[PDB]
Design an enzyme around this catalytic site. Structure first.
Site, PDB file in Angstrom:
ATOM      1  N   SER A  56       0.856  -1.196   0.000  1.00 18.88           N
ATOM      2  CA  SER A  56       0.000   0.000   0.000  1.00 18.88           C
ATOM      3  C   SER A  56       0.893   1.248   0.000  1.00 18.88           C
ATOM      4  O   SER A  56       0.987   1.941   1.010  1.00 18.88           O
ATOM      5  CB  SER A  56      -0.962  -0.016   1.209  1.00 18.88           C
ATOM      6  N   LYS A 138       7.439   2.405   7.908  1.00 15.17           N
ATOM      7  CA  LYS A 138       5.985   2.711   7.857  1.00 15.17           C
ATOM      8  C   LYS A 138       5.126   1.523   7.392  1.00 15.17           C
ATOM      9  O   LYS A 138       4.078   1.283   7.953  1.00 15.17           O
ATOM     10  CB  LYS A 138       5.671   3.987   7.045  1.00 15.17           C
ATOM     11  N   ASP A 170       3.804   8.103   7.044  1.00 10.57           N
ATOM     12  CA  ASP A 170       3.536   8.370   5.635  1.00 10.57           C
ATOM     13  C   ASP A 170       3.363   9.889   5.381  1.00 10.57           C
ATOM     14  O   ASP A 170       3.439  10.724   6.316  1.00 10.57           O
ATOM     15  CB  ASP A 170       2.288   7.614   5.168  1.00 10.57           C
TER      16      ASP A 170
HETATM   17  N1  LIG Z   1      -0.258   5.699   8.432  1.00  6.35           N
HETATM   18  C1  LIG Z   1      -1.177   5.107   7.583  1.00  6.35           C
HETATM   19  N2  LIG Z   1      -0.868   4.742   6.348  1.00  6.35           N
HETATM   20  C2  LIG Z   1      -1.848   4.212   5.569  1.00  6.35           C
HETATM   21  C3  LIG Z   1      -3.142   4.042   5.955  1.00  6.35           C
HETATM   22  N3  LIG Z   1      -3.894   3.481   4.877  1.00  6.35           N
HETATM   23  C4  LIG Z   1      -2.973   3.278   3.802  1.00  6.35           C
HETATM   24  O1  LIG Z   1      -3.210   2.766   2.704  1.00  6.35           O
HETATM   25  N4  LIG Z   1      -1.718   3.774   4.228  1.00  6.35           N
HETATM   26  C5  LIG Z   1      -0.484   3.752   3.445  1.00  6.35           C
HETATM   27  C6  LIG Z   1       0.371   4.991   3.386  1.00  6.35           C
HETATM   28  C7  LIG Z   1       1.788   4.427   3.217  1.00  6.35           C
HETATM   29  O2  LIG Z   1       2.144   4.184   1.862  1.00  6.35           O
HETATM   30  C8  LIG Z   1       1.723   3.094   3.990  1.00  6.35           C
HETATM   31  C9  LIG Z   1       2.451   3.245   5.356  1.00  6.35           C
HETATM   32  O3  LIG Z   1       2.090   4.311   6.134  1.00  6.35           O
HETATM   33  O4  LIG Z   1       0.315   2.764   4.071  1.00  6.35           O
HETATM   34  C10 LIG Z   1      -3.540   4.391   7.298  1.00  6.35           C
HETATM   35  O5  LIG Z   1      -4.638   4.260   7.841  1.00  6.35           O
HETATM   36  N5  LIG Z   1      -2.499   4.944   8.070  1.00  6.35           N
END
Ligand SMILES: Nc1nc2c([nH]c(=O)n2[C@H]2C[C@H](O)[C@@H](CO)O2)c(=O)[nH]1
Ligand SMILES: Nc1nc2c([nH]c(=O)n2[C@H]2C[C@H](O)[C@@H](CO)O2)c(=O)[nH]1
Length: 252
Positions: A56, A138, A170
């Protein structure tokens, strides 16, 4: 930044951890993950959710929209071989079109791995080795949060995450930290200096009783409202207001 830090602590102190857990059940991402778990069961559903969290990154649009697509895709599809089916999904999704081969490569490393939902600390250490990243990175800590969503859905329980797993820094978290006046360096720099940002939210966690991965939910819900002007009641009005301290930190 010290004065801002105090304001943030004494505002979030208004919310118990119980209220935060309740608020967190309305994250659109929780619903997507829970739809997949209800369809496929705890083991298969948690594996699918895990793989999705691990890739993600570098999305075309919003985190929330990417998760909604994941939920709809797997909720109405039979799953037979987990690796195969997941790699096929990677090749299909419009949110994942950037750097598809590197995504597939990451997914292939964690493909056969079954997470331990009752010991998320053990799972984080194991994931750090499988994926090959520092435990505070992250995507690793975010994956732990997703795994908690899958466990809570499956079992119909609350579970409070540990204080010693830090917040995922992020670009949304970095911007909101800057918007609240907690850091004097730019959000783009904060992505690189992620440990310094993690140290701030650890302080906030200790003083409020809300662990970092639950604070993450508050920032993400608040961000939806401050950055995009959407889901305006995701958190209380006073929580939103915390992240509107700097000029620019409003919707267009
Ligand atoms: N901190 C964070 N990051 C998220 C959420 N949902 C999501 O798709 N992300 C993504 C952003 C980043 O590429 C990765 C790690 O933070 O995950 C979420 O809820 N929180
Ligand atoms: N669908 C798919 N599967 C792959 C690719 N590369 C690779 O190693 N696989 C794996 C997944 C699974 O473990 C096995 C097919 O059952 O082959 C690949 O490029 N596509």
């Amino acid at each position: 930044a010290e004065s801002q830090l105090k304001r943030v602590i004494e505002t979030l102190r208004r919310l118990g951890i119980e209220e935060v857990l309740k608020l967190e059940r309305r994250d659109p991402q929780y619903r997507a993950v829970c739809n997949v778990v209800k369809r496929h069961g705890e083991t298969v559903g948690s594996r699918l959710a895990m793989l999705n969290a691990l890739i993600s990154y570098r999305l075309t649009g919003k985190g929330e929209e990417h998760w909604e697509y994941f939920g709809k895709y797997f909720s109405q599809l039979e799953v037979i071989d987990l690796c195969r089916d997941f790699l096929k999904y990677i090749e299909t999704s419009p949110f994942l079109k950037i750097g598809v081969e590197a995504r597939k490569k990451r997914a292939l490393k964690a493909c056969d791995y079954v997470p331990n939902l009752e010991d998320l600390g053990l799972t984080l250490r194991q994931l750090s080795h499988i994926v090959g990243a520092r435990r505070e990175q992250k995507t690793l800590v975010f994956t732990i949060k997703i795994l908690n969503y899958a466990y809570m859905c499956s079992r119909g329980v609350n579970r409070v995450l540990p204080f010693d797993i830090p917040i995922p820094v992020d670009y949304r978290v970095a911007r909101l930290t800057w918007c609240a006046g907690l850091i004097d360096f730019p959000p783009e720099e904060a992505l690189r200096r992620y440990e310094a940002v993690q140290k701030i939210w650890d302080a906030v966690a200790r003083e409020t009783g809300i662990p970092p991965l639950h604070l993450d939910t508050l920032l993400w819900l608040a961000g939806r409202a401050v950055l995009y002007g959407e889901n305006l009641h995701g958190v209380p009005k006073e929580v939103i207001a915390l992240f509107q301290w700097r000029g620019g930190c409003r919707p267009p």
